[PDB]
């Protein structure tokens, strides 16, 4: 039902944007723009764009077709903004830097949609500031990622828990966990500025998911983080949790594409019991997050947050 | 007016320290200096033509229509916002001719609405400022996309180079942020609604096209510092030449060889495109002055005449 309705909203928004006569498009440029849309936006699983509509339905307690359409419009706006973010991620992870311009086209589609479908609403400026906040912090996250990565070129003393956490927060969690639920609440008439507790919980949830992926990379059926000199949660823990010759071991073997040295790092990890440290982190995190979800007065917000936390647990 | 400029220049420091210490963004000491250096490189360097012209157009509109220090500060804030947005645009322009330049540029882009929000959210014209900068950015990047399609990717069959394509690129790529944005900022600050100024907008846009044609000519005939470019010169040469001259142009254009370059230059000279450019300049200043005077509002006329005079013959 939602599956079949949501996806048509992509076509609706696409044909709106292509035939917004504000810019003079020829046949050729129109096809250029349509291709750079259809490549990036409508492809994937549509996790977050759908989760906008799903969180909206969850909050509701009866849905009109207009309500569903607008929730879908917000969802697709999320998909667009994420397309922009992911094009930049492509560019930043290993005869055409068209990729920049393509990405920048998609970014500038986001407020055209928001303006076309929500200007009359009384929460228009709140949506604009939401997407603005999310974009500012996503790109600030990318900037932290650059500096940390570059500056951890050999000097692994750059890799600290605060740096890891700020990167995970601003780069991903914001557009990944806050943005869709925030979209739903703003449509629901709420003011986000009286939801700092929910915001913080979703942000910690994003940090949680990143720590998960960091561990899964190193322990699961292949992950290449220790080869790639990445700032994993595992290496950040290993740094301050090891002695002096273990620091020498890590400094020797980290960032090395050689399964011998990779295995040296893996077995320093195992001898430091970072699998059990991760199990403890997971348990304490799910407890803190479930506990502080229940602390929230609103029960439906709790339902949405518990949905998310359950979906990502033990993944 | 170097007495009154020094106030503008301090607003850069004010906005910079605001943005750097927005603890909403989690910045370490380290990242804080990274952001400061990527600001100080791009934004405060140049002559500050457009950022100052925001404040100058505001003063002009006031003087003709007491002028508080807050008014000046806010006009300056808008000016520096223009400087930032232009820095972003110019970083992308550099890029389009290790991969940090993208990230730096995007940091500068996302500073713009932080400033607009910090200093103009309370105002009743906030959404109008946001839509102004949004429109300008959409059309600048659309201009870049047209530039990609037309120039580099529309290579050696130069029959792609037409006056309408040239004009659309010049309009959306540059004219918008270069000539509309600064005066529009001042008018929005003045309480006006831009949607009843389409004539002024169109005039400033044509003015941007004019300035680009100027730069095109200076390139081919001039010194300062420093083929296959979509120049106004080649666009004129195309439809103003016969058939063996078309053969000459197709032979020699896009060719890095001073012999063939000179073949193009002297086809230009035998077509009298220097005199065509002088005529273009005269007819353009006349069309623009005439349609400026057509505007009902006299102070808007004063601002537009200021701009058109500043960019004339130089």
Author numbering:
A (entry chain B): 3 to 63, 72 to 104, 120 to 246, 253 to 346
B (entry chain A): 1 to 65, 72 to 103, 121 to 249, 259 to 346
Give the published text.
Specifically, the equivalent positions of residues Cys94 and Ala95 on α4 in EuTPT3 are occupied by Tyr88 and Phe89 in EuFPS1. To test this hypothesis, we replaced Cys94 and Ala95 in EuTPT3 with tyrosine and phenylalanine, respectively, to create the double mutant EuTPT3(C94Y/A95F). An in vitro test demonstrated that the double mutant lacked the activity for synthesizing ultrahigh molecular weight TPI. Interestingly, we determined the crystal structure of the EuTPT3(C94Y/A95F) mutant protein at 3.3 Å resolution and found that it formed the FPS dimeric conformation. Thus, the replacement of only two residues switched the dimeric conformation from the TPT-type to the FPS-type dimer. These results indicated that Cys94 and Ala95 on α4 in EuTPT3 and the corresponding amino acid in other EuTPTs were essential for the TPT-dimer conformation, which forms the path for newly synthesized ultrahigh molecular weight TPI.
Ultrahigh molecular weight cis-1,4-polyisoprene and trans-1,4-polyisoprene (TPI), which are the principal components of natural rubber and gutta-percha, respectively, are also isoprenoid metabolites that are assumed to be synthesized by specialized prenyltransferases. These prenyltransferases are divided into two major groups, the cis-1,4-prenyltransferases (CPTs) and trans-1,4-prenyltransferases (TPTs), based on the stereochemistry of the double bond formed during IPP condensation. Similar to EuFPS1 and other prenyltransferases, the EuTPT3 subunits were composed of 10 core helices (α1-α10) with a deep pocket that included two DDxxD motifs responsible for substrates binding.
